Design a binder for this molecule. Structure first.
Ligand SMILES: CC(=O)CCC=C(C)C
Length: 125
C-alpha cells in the first residue's frame, strides 16, 4: 500500500504547524511554487530545480545540518515527534549516504529515497 496517508493524525499536526513559517521563508527565498511542493508530496517524483533548493533550505532553517550544511540524520530524527520515530527510521535506513554535487542535489536525493522507501508516510510541506 503506496497511497499517501493524509488525515487529522498524520502527518503530525504539531509538526506541520512548526514547519509552516519555515515553509514561508524557504518558498520566498527560492521561488518554488506551492503546487510543485504538493505534487512531490502526494503524487509523483519530479525534477524541479527550485524545489530541490527549497528542500535544502528547509533542512538549514530547521537546524538539522552539520557545519558544511549537510543533513545530519541523527539531528533530523531527534527533531521529529516521538510518534513517527519508528516509521522515519525504517524510511531512512537505506538512505544513509546521499549522492550529489550540491547541497540542493543531496537534499533532493534524500527526499526521493525516503519517498521510494515508504510513499504512504513520506510527505513534504
Ligand atoms: C529522520 C528520517 O526521516 C531518517 C532518519 C534515518 C535514520 C535515523 C537511519
Amino acid at each position: 500500500d503506496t497511497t499517501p496517508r493524509r488525515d487529522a493524525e498524520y502527518p503530525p499536526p504539531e509538526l506541520l504547524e512548526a514547519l509552516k513559517p519555515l515553509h514561508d521563508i524557504c518558498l520566498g527565498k527560492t521561488g518554488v511554487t506551492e503546487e510543485a511542493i504538493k505534487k512531490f508530496s502526494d503524487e509523483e517524483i519530479h525534477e524541479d530545480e527550485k524545489l530541490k533548493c527549497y528542500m535544502n533550505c528547509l533542512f538549514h532553517e530547521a537546524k538539522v545540518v552539520d557545519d558544511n550544511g549537510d543533513v545530519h540524520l541523527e539531528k533530523l530524527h531527534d527533531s521529529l515527534p516521538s510518534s513517527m520515530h519508528d516509521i522515519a527510521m525504517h524510511m531512512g535506513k537505506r538512505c544513509l549516504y546521499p549522492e550529489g554535487e550540491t547541497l540542493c542535489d543531496k537534499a533532493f536525493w534524500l527526499h526521493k529515497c525516503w519517498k521510494q522507501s515508504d510513499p504512504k508516510h513520506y510527505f513534504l510541506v
